[model samples]
Target chain A: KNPKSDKFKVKRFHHIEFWCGDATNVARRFSWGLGMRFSAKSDLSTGNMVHASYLLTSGDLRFLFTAPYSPSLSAGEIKPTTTASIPSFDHGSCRSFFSSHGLGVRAVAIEVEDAESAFSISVANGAIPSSPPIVLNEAVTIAEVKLYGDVVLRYVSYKAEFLPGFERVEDASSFPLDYGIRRLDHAVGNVPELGPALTYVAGFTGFHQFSGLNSAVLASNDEMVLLPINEPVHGTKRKSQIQTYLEHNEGAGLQHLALMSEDIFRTLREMRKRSSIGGFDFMPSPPPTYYQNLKKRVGDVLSDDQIKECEELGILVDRDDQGTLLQIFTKPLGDRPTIFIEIIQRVGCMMYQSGGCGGFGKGNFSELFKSIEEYEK
Target chain B: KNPKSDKFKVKRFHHIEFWCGDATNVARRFSWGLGMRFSAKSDLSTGNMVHASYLLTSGDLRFLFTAPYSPSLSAGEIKPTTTASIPSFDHGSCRSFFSSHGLGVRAVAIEVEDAESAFSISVANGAIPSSPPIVLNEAVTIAEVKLYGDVVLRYVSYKAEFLPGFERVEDASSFPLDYGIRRLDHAVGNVPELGPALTYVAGFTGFHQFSGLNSAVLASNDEMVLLPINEPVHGTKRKSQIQTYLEHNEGAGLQHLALMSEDIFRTLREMRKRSSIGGFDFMPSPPPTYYQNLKKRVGDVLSDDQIKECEELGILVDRDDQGTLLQIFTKPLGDRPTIFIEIIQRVGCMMYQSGGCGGFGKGNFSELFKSIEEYEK
Candidate 1:
């Protein structure tokens, strides 16, 4: 890889907006299951009659779940209100995506210093304009470009409470978790071929491929952090998770989100309590043989007690030369196995003789694949 | 009123099922906000891949929130999988209703002595059949008939744990609510004309209109209990709540549901905490003048502290010679002001001069109307 100039600069991951059919309900799940707080909302009550959107935040990570009302207003025997706002964007893209994909990630916003310049430069560099730069209010502006599988890459400039049109909401239903998920570790996206998506981002947004694992996985190293990406193996009869996701989702989209947790043990414990109460299912447990192999591979980095506890709790562990990581994945968030969740804790950052950094628990891939295979069974 | 024979006898309200676009999220909200626990679920995991449904219960009250996956598999440049299950009943009415109404009540099931007899009698008496009587596994038998809007009247005969096809689910997201809401007091329906709906129910289901309030409201006194119903004023542009519901819901539908609470004070307090934390909003507060009038009207029925507490908590009090009733209303549950919630507590049950029982807090109509008017403003 060659060194590149800082052209289209991204500050950090701003927020992720899911184009769902029920925003409030999804927000409730995030509030209860992930320990996120309902922060802001926009709907008919807020004078945004087009769609209802809810903003939830855990620590620095934020999620905006938006849903549309019925598309047909007065096409039936019953005459709908003429004032009904149309559930469409410039074209019928938003409604179309909702119709085809159901609940899905529509945008992965990246905070940019100058949204206008970012929009101009990206469009100039062959990026498809999903949405042009637009000022939401005096304090905030945003621009959007197309990404894999109907997803959008948004450049947002914000200095206000949240995106405009949204008012701060006081969610009475959000209960507290013992320890909370902190930030977005990295988001994973699935495509038919990862090569085009990687090349597209590198060429248009000036992103660099920081690491790679053959043709199975890739990660973008932006601001010294990793955003892992993946694609299914070509011409393989072996059913991959990405292939199943494509079959269900109808196309490529966000696969899973890895949330960073400061205290993985406590967070997983609270989550386990929720699981016991009929909340969410974790990915099926890895075989006993996997855990035995993990102990031998992990060596002395983690204590025997830690390994024992993780085994009992079904938490997976992986290690790199620089760090040992504890991680777990939740079952699909919805009926389809399209979108799911992951939690990662990077422990043991002691320098290793191999002289490299830790990325997404690549070592855990075999165990993960095996667990998912059992789940699909 | 004439005595009616036990033609189609209903023992009790079984459950209410909301046909939502996202059942899991709605289930989460109900579990967190209403103290309902997830008891069962039907989805792909449960081998019912057509749609997802969750059964939540609090005391004797049950709620089933259901939703369908995207209908089309792959139809265009994207190829859809052929294994996707189609959303249907024996007929396509359920899917049609979902497509038209989005998320709204599809069924209000009542436990009947014989579902087969009930269905036969209902159909014989001019009821439109929605689903034919069918046995789920060996445990339960259920039948459905069309009612107002796309709502259904389901007759359920249960001999085991929940209806068939649903496996018990453990929801980890559910938390303890301080004062749980109890049984359904009465469910209200809003029709363009209350006469037809009342006639339909009375003629087909043998339900009698026990009480009447001019031409606008009617209540069925089944076995000495009241179930109130209402209709929009004839040719009125003033926009009553019923009228608003008709316009937004596209037809006649279930309006607000009243849940009986033993401790209104504690329930409202817990609910207020949730509201403060951004849960659900209660109806707007009345003017100070309204409270002053209430104290005068209530007289010796409630103590001074009780009056003060009611004023502080926005609990509306209504008194008859028999007793006093406390009530409060929630703002609309979803985007449209079509469906909402009401919580009521019967404080006193003294023998009444009228020699009958108390119904919906009729005395609060003025205050309720004023508050709603303010909300619309």
Candidate 2:
């Protein structure tokens, strides 16, 4: 059972920001590869010379890619504004972060009714301050806390424009359509101390382990076992993807970002097109035996045709008596075996069940691990 | 008069390499935005883990974008081997270069019949050797020398694969078609000592002063003047694009790359489409008066309808007695305001000519400077 909290609450996923070496190029990649549209931008030409930040959106999902215009300055010193009125964050930090980590997630933001309250409560509960609650003009207020590794957890509230300095991208409408990704399914992080990480997030953010936030431990018949943990709980396993991520990434950071899709077949089809024509690689396909076993395990839930299609496309499937889920993963986004993407579609039940929701396709974990292991080999 | 030398001959432009923070995304930008096809890649998965490289091509034009797999190591230290059979340059030098400047041209390679001869003569003639001649297996041999600023001029020859380590990219056929950019028109560099840079290139490389290579000083009616200098000669101008590039880039570097196109209208139309839909920005449009003056100058060569189309699309035109040229410029590729792009189409003359060839639209420099000045404002 989970207890209700009155101190702080997250409304929804706000946006995720990536600190990149080339913000414009990354923004274009997302626009073409994910069908995300350019929504807003703040840069030197746009009056903000300290850094360049581009805002892209697909349905309810938003992503911000930022890069400093100058890397010579120390972390957070890029902004040269003498005006104490206009708020600017230290982009030098991002520059240094990029230098050390390459291109990866820097922050994951969540929308809240009261950003100030969220920051205050999280800080009082022991979360490290990344950015204090500050108003970005009349339109927005934001605060950030250190998350696992270099990732930051941000709380933001907005009413008018995207951010104070950002202007509406005039030609944003010219971008392509979102294939099907409608919202963030969930974001996963891989940390060395999984138990402590979960405890820290739960204690500070008031997120409790229930349905979707529950954790599980699963293993293959071979030497490898996997522990898939959610935001509020921890589970244990061996020869795991989490450990692999830590080794490759050199520390903790975002493992993967999952995007929600309504039509699994359509989304996968479009994603496949992007992969084939656009050079975005999907994760290595599972062995045919995995699909055969998948058909045996969820035979009654999915039709023979559905099974055949998933098998051909390497989409993974999982099910309970009441519902089914379809999911696929992309190969790592960069040279490092770190941050990637997941596209997921849930059938039968669309509800966001906390600990028991099982929305993340726990049944597919063994096959996914096998696939990743094959890639590593 | 132009003289040809049999001692050291330069073939066509081979490929240009960019030292990127993320090579894959930049590859996608060229693949989709410019309709270049993915040709090859070398990365961790391909058994080359020290760095990642992607090769793309449009007609005879080739581009290679590269990045280190791990950003943690000092550039030169990234590659380690006890045998030392593998070739590795001080990429850490490139990493630091990128830190100072954003994404930009690192090397411009030219195909040569004999890379050894080219390197030897260039060095003997005062060029500094960045990399001495080395055979990359049986299929390739390469050498490099310092060009203006931090850019390197490479001479390479290959018979089998791309390089000794690179394999033919299996999925290269999956990318889109080239809009129309067929080959290199010319690559431009910005230097404080423009005359010396031109002299160094010409004296060592055996490249003669041709029409496009000759320099001219043009000025707008206002306070701006632009000196259009190629690799062989230099001219003088005030508050010019060259000076602006030096200040913003922090030193000399690649200024812009001009790509030759066959169908100016069709190619520019496709380019405009990509810019609008892809979030890529073209150079700011010239004022209405610029077009009015253009019509007066070359009204006999181009019809009112043709000029109107060029005006609407922001394509600039320059004319000599024998032919007319159509060209357009892209805004700087990144935050440094250094390297940008130029697309050129020769309406009547397709061959490279010396003296009055005017491949770079010299007539349009005044208007182009006006447009850039407007962007600066």
Candidate 3:
């Protein structure tokens, strides 16, 4: 058919685990946000097990964050008997005091291929399975096994898969029977009433909601208010403290992840020629008055080539009549600020709803809590 | 009481949740390595419960990633295997075979002060609660609850203790404490000879046991040799493909985090002035040939003011003579890269090892197996 060679098969992006309290503020936010280079680290310790592990990475992801060295959590009992200071970085009030107290969001991993047949098919489809396979090295071997706590999907196998050892895909013709992973973009939440946590993640992961939202109010992104929030109203009660603090963080974890590029203009022109050759320095520009307020607010509902393809890939369109879509949002990597990513490309949407007026995508809830009060002030 | 009345206790960093299988390639490497944006994602259902979440920061670390949409890896024929790649991207052996099949690394949150008495003193200390209090929002609530893994310590609390809304500090407030996150740092295991899954994570949790590592090959970062082993040593090896891949991957998941910052020079000059004013975009200057072979190998056991403070803030010094250190590493921010962070300060050297020569830390296992051999070529 078209470019139907369909055999790039895809294979790399296998690691990102974090449950950090402070691995040196996650190695100073991955040495200043993703130039990642550490490489390897371990402590493990047995017969009374010690615990510690580090293995940073940049290109293909790899992160890991472990703690616990024999009964922990007692640095004056998770604080506040009456404070005067402390509490600023706010990581969503420490994930709302670690999801309200017993600590929240942990266990999420990917890289699979027969870890005991994917933990016996997520334990014959019920999950809960926590351990069974194990390995650490000899060209790479693994299977820590886990699922449901957001994800522990790990399966790994490596010895360079089977051995050409450095990879373009050749170790004994890649054994471990061809591992694969392709789509599922967008993730992040603090859930309380993000329209019943987006209808509980489109009915728990079968996904397929994307109604295409549009909220504006930069006020000077050329005097803004692109406003729209079509019909997403669950547990509504907004006078806006930023839709009342994401309806008070009741639903979300795993902050970023967008990864899906069948061909968003050749993956944004190969990420804008790899950020014009300096090789990506936090790209994503779009804000020169958002194309002069997209010709002063939704130009007759978009199209001069859909607003020149959202200004040649700066994309951020938002609409209602059940159409117009093309999003963009990223940032957040390692060192536990917790996840990030969102490339979104639904050209004629079908229900990521929040395309507002009454449903509230209008400036997406008080400018997203006034940009989280300008990023936690 | 000097200037501005020292009344600025603002604390920062609030969210960090991860456990992956592709949250969109950990949100496109956190927006091309740290400009961090991501803002919406929800799931983990409702008519009752079924999880999944995501959200990154500039929305200030509101990270979330969770899974468990209820007994349906496919509802029972079970068939969930592929070992890796559920929503994969860029592929690193499909994200390390979905993080060696258990999805790897889980739980770590902070920002407390009474999420139900810090979830009843972190479940009276043994930890492993995972969701309790529940409020999500009565306006801006997160009442609190969730805990399963991590013990690295740290504490801080009291800003009038979460401005009281849970019946105004329920029982006068004590709360989820810990914030000083101390020891146990570094963990990563792909499975293949790791000593019965690092002795099954030192008998499932709270880790112990310390040194006796090998697999390396340093050289430019200064010789360390060990990697690729086989002449069989370090005690019997019946099959030893690292020991049949640690008897086929069985335990331990989190793999990175070595946080221990007591003012790491004001947290590395407020993290390189918030990473050169953009938030997070590090690494790339690391090849003056690794500080010219780290000044011809350990600049004579460090000291020209600790090798000019690791060549002026690029910090990477390493030493011997019982101990001398200065370390640096970072570059991961969720999306199943597992985890990342390691900052180290040491001087009178308390030694967590990894220093190198015989002990550890030499060219980080030949620069992380040469970036896992470029994610396996």
Candidate 4:
């Protein structure tokens, strides 16, 4: 793949759709756990006879939770007038998949300048065609291409605040819960290898690349969408964490999504305050040695006081040639140790790019793997 | 099937185990929603690689949530040394159940004086056997019989605080957020009819009876375990709500479980305060006519202020001459409008029975159904 080749334009992440057995509870947990607003819903009342869907919003982030319903007599009075031809809302679309996958990210919707072009070029290049572009009324058009495992790369162009079929959630409070989580920073995928997964998306999107010893980061033309593709390195005495993730998930899939926070302290503090109620259970801090040697490893990128506070919150401070990055991860959200979240904060913007300076914490990322492995032990 | 026959001696509801796709989040939601304590857990750490489980407790009530994991290389170091032969945890038990039922009550464990005799008599008296008696250890012995849908009626005799494999949760708060919810009052199952379903359990256990027009309540010899079996009545303008539930659930199953509370107002107040943050959403009260003519219906069982407070919390007040019962129903707990919880408070026990006098709120149970149907409409 040539970097000079034409790449379809993507604006940002539109929303991520999780296919679960119970969308309402899952959506409620996410809304309360992450301090996001329950913004909209689609169900039997909304003429969606096939599934129940909930929409959540936090600043620029949106999460779509969907739970399929077996055909029943309860919905005869209010079936959808029309259904998408490609992304079928039929029960079969989710039934067999959910049976095998349990619960997981089915689609990662991306806002694109030209939905048709994004999908067309993706398939024409190397991506496997999942669904052809389907217009969902005047305001929304969508297309899809197969991504890792069963996940799909959805290309959507919309003018409406949300997708069609969903009604606004009037019951939710207007009160704001500011956790400093601005938006999705990066979506990392764990696969058997970085070669095919990286090439498939890169060949179609012509994303600007940043290579790792084993991982590859692909940034969109606008620098809005960042994808760090990772693969397991063989020859380890024990199984690689990424390899374990793939096996647990049954195949390659999204591992962890990074949410960018403006203030790591405030975010971690608020989460800790709510941790007893409905907030997330984060991973423990790295070994004491990791913090003890932080100054020498990261230099004076952060003040001594700042580093101490970071250690207190179990936040890891790392740096590349650009600047410093503060990051922390959460424990596996479900029974399987497949998917979780990473909260990251990139600092010293004046010393790096306007959008982001600190790279994906490449140097200190293994510290998390080692610590999480130790946590399991 | 006569009540005069000898009955099996039962202690109480041991614990109800739910088969779910993700037990962690489900247990978390249940812990916060019902104000139940996160008591214990079992997983790979406990050498149970086939499933992950969490035990939640509130007073005499306990809920065990179990989620299955696909066979993986991650657990060769720590698979269960000895698996249960009867209620086989061999992947397919929960794997197929959860897939078909989505999220549901898989087993309702009843504490019996002699689990062996319970199982032996149940099977001998025409009850279908699900699993033969399988003792966990010296502390626990168990057996099961078929119940409605894919659910099982588990008989157990246990001296342990929880099942054998689970480890106590050390992190939960000891502070009780008393919702006043006590032990399980009754569990209601929705089948096609009262005839076969009632006879099946009654014939086996020879329990006492309290007949509804369309439902039948069967109580164990000690008056502890009460199971009200319900069937949809015909001649409704549309389909019966129970019929709709059965269709949506795919078959007959546990419709709702009743939790007894000492004070309805205080219980409801605490729930409403937490409703916005991981609490249950209750059904609205009956129509204006139902409350307007309440003076004649119950004949001053509750004071005017008490009735007004009940109405404020959308509580339904009813009686069967024994005493007044205050009850409220929560919205469906999952995508399917099948399973829910009912909070019931029986007052004036001095004028009624020692344990309870509500008679399952016989006079006004339909008020909830009618109100919920209206809410859905």
Q: State which candidate, 1 or 3, has the greater lDDT.
A: 1
Order of quality (TM-score) = 4, 2, 1, 3
Model 4 clash number: 0
Report the C-alpha lDDT of model 3 over A1-377, residue by residue, as the tens digit: 11222111112335555543333234333322333444444322211122233445443444554433221212233333211011111223332233221122344443443344544544554444444554433444344333222333344544332211121222221112101112333223333234543333222222233212212111101111111112223444544322322322222344344433334554454444433111222335454455545655568777567677666777555554554444555433321223444444443433432221122123333433444455455
Tens digits of lDDT, candidate 1, A97-153: 755665778888888888889899998998988777766556776888887789888
Looking at model 3, what is the TM-score of chain A?
Answer: 0.25
State what share of the real interface contacts each candidate retains: 0.28, 0.49, 0.00, 0.50
Candidate 3 residues lying further than 4 Å off, grouped into runs, are A1-377, B1-22, B25-77, B80-104, B107-299, B302-306, B309-311, B314-318, B322-325, B329-340, B343-377
Question: Please, what are the lDDT tens digits per residue for candidate 1 over residues B287-319?
Answer: 656677676677677778877888898888777
Model 1 compared with the native: what TM-score? Answer: 0.82
Query: What are the runs in model 4 whose C-alpha is more than 4 Å off?
Result: A1-6, A72-90, A159-161, A172-176, A211-213, A287-305, A350-356, A365-377, B1-6, B72-86, B172-178, B211-213, B287-305, B350-356, B365-377
Q: Which window of 10 residues has the lowest lDDT sum in candidate 4 chain B?
A: B77-86
Classified by CAPRI criteria, candidate 1 counts as acceptable
| Candidate 3 C-alpha lDDT tens digits along B64-160 | 4333222222233222231111121112332233333223334334434434454555445444444444333322222222211221111123434
**Ranking of all predicted structures according to DockQ, beginning with the best and ending with the worst:** 4, 2, 1, 3
lDDT of model 3, residue B129: 48
Local lDDT at A47 for model 4? 69
**Model 2 has how many clashing residue pairs?**
18
